Amino acid sequence: RKVPTGSNPQKN
């Protein structure tokens, strides 16, 4: 689990 710049890896 990692929350990138999109604050959520739904497609980021």
Let me know: does 6 contact 12? Beta carbons within 8 Å: yes
DSSP state of 5: T
Size (the chain), residues: 12
Tell me which DSSP letter residue 6 carries. Answer: T
Which pair of tokens denotes residue 5?
A: 């710049």
Q: Distance between alpha carbon 6 and the CA centroid of its chain, in Å?
A: 5
Please check whether residue 8 is in contact with residue 2, taking contact to mean a CB–CB distance below 8 angstroms. no
Q: What's the token pair of residue 10?
A: 């739904």
CA distance to 1, 10, per residue, from 6 (Å): 13, 8
**Sign of the C-alpha dihedral computed for residues 12, 2, 10 and 7 taken in this order:** negative
